[PDB]
């Protein structure tokens, strides 16, 4: 029995307004006990212009938090939401991830970080999210990736890195997945994938490589070419199966058409 009006728990008027919408309330200065806070299992505040989620610390049951097209700077209030299952942070201008914001959310099944101005990931952010199935990182401004950033997500089956500025993938960045069936790398800045980066994705059915500046004059492309040739029924585009979507750069010829004698290691 602490009869505490909503607008003190949540300083953000719009955010408190989603609470007033979440509990079936009449005004916004009404009192709310902790008991009714713990009736909140899902907070869809998609597209509602919220600046700070300060106060969401005290909603112990959010299993479904989707905050889209907002103005979020500070998601540090989200690391105590252990029962978070689906997290969807879209359209927000957050430039960076706190080291260890996701450490606690061990029940995460799907994590959609989309359309933020992310330029790097921390060295180990995903390390504790071992039950992760769907990881969607698309439309970020990532350029490089940390080593073994995915080495802990052993249950992953869908990984979306499309539409970033990935210039190169780290050696064997994909070695410990083995369950991934869908991997997207389209619309990125890759010249070449590491020798044998896809060699252990023995559950893979859909992959997208199109719209990359693949460098078919360097000898590092050879691996990609001999892989597309082996698995053409694996490569997709926009319509269907297009294993020719992985075009070279400046010639627009299919990657899988590159022959050994048509490159030179002296270049790269």
């Amino acid at each position: 029995t602490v009869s505490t009006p909503i607008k003190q728990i949540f300083p953000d008027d719009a955010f408190a307004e989603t609470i007033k919408a979440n509990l079936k309330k009449k005004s916004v200065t009404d009192a709310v006990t902790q008991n009714e806070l713990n009736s909140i299992d899902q907070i869809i505040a998609n597209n509602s212009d919220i600046k700070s989620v300060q106060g969401i610390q005290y909603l112990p049951n959010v299993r479904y938090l989707a905050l889209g097209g907002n103005k979020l700077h500070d998601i540090s209030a989200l690391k105590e939401l252990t029962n978070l299952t689906y997290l969807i942070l879209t359209g927000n201008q957050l430039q960076s991830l706190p080291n260890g914001v996701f450490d606690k959310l061990t029940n995460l099944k799907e994590l959609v970080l989309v359309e933020n101005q992310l330029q790097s990931l921390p060295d180990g952010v995903f390390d504790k999210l071992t039950n992760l199935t769907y990881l969607y990182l698309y439309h970020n401004q990532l350029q490089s990736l940390p080593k073994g950033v995915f080495d802990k997500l052993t249950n992953l089956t869908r990984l979306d890195l499309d539409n970033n500025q990935l210039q190169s993938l780290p050696e064997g960045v994909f070695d410990k997945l083995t369950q991934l069936k869908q991997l997207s790398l389209n619309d990125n800045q890759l010249k070449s994938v590491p020798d044998g980066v896809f060699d252990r994705l023995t559950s893979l059915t859909h992959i997208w490589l199109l719209n990359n500046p693949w460098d078919c004059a360097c000898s590092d492309i050879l691996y990609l070419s001999r892989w597309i040739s082996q698995h053409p029924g694996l490569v997709f585009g926009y319509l269907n199966l297009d294993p020719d979507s992985a075009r070279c750069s400046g010639t627009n010829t299919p990657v899988r058409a590159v022959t050994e004698a048509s490159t030179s290691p002296s270049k790269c």
């Epitope: 010249k191 590491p194 078919c216 360097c218 400046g250």
Partner: antibody
Framework: VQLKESGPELVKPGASVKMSCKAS????????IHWVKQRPGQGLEWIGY????????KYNEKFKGKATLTSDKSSSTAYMDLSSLTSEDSAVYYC??????????????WGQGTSVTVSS | DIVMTQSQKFMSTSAGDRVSITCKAS??????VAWYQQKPGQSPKALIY???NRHTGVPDRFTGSGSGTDFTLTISNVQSEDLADYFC?????????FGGGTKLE
């Protein structure tokens, strides 16, 4: 491998300059071309980067109203147009690559440099 | 915006040399810093990339040190062709920012 910048200019204040950078020796369309300003006397200053594949471009907010970056993938050239000139733009300008190799990130090779002089 | 400070604009040394040039960032650039040798009338050479790597063709004489906020370029037997102006560049975050330059005696 080498980047070859257009020849020197001398323009009156308020007028236009567009300079060129002709890539040679690698695959121009798969590696980004940064642009750097250097005034006689003080350090370097970064202008922008325009990657000749899309081609999109970040500018440094000090320059965003001046520098315009373009490229023609056909002739392996990146261009930089600086308008309208004042006399603080009197400097040497450079273009240089951003080459990667999985774990090798650098600028690699710089162009010889385009000198710009501006006065009456 | 990130700031690279080169705590010494001028150095002094003589062949069979000893010098170390420091360059400290205002924020945390994570191992992403490069060093450039620029002697007059020339475009900068690229000496070291990503904290510690000798860009191909650079002697064992040049070594680069450090990570985080604090970076060093150490040069050993300094020789007559090593007299030039060295500066550092962070390419972690944006805008890319340089150092002040350090000209050697």
């Amino acid at each position: 491998v080498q980047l070859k910048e257009s020849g020197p200019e001398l323009v009156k204040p308020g007028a236009s300059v567009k300079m060129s950078c002709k890539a040679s020796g690698y695959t121009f369309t798969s590696y980004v071309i940064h642009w750097v300003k250097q005034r006689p006397g003080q350090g370097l200053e970064w202008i922008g980067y325009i990657n000749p594949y899309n081609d999109g471009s970040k500018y440094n907010e000090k320059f965003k109203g001046k520098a315009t970056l373009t490229s023609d993938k056909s002739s392996s050239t990146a261009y930089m147009d600086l308008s309208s000139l004042t006399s603080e733009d009197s400097a040497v300008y450079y273009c240089a690559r951003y080459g990667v190799r999985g774990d090798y990130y650098a600028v690699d090779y710089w162009g010889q440099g385009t000198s710009v002089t501006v006065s009456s | 915006d990130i700031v690279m400070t080169q705590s010494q604009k001028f150095m002094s040394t003589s062949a069979g040399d000893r010098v170390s040039i420091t360059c400290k960032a205002s924020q945390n650039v994570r191992t992403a810093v490069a060093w450039y040798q620029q002697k007059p009338g020339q475009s900068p050479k690229a000496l070291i990339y990503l904290a510690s790597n000798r860009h191909t063709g650079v002697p064992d004489r040049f070594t680069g040190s450090g990570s985080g906020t604090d970076f060093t370029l150490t040069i050993s037997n300094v020789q007559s062709e090593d007299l030039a102006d060295y500066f550092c560049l962070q390419h972690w975050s944006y805008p890319y920012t340089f150092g002040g330059g350090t000209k050697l005696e």
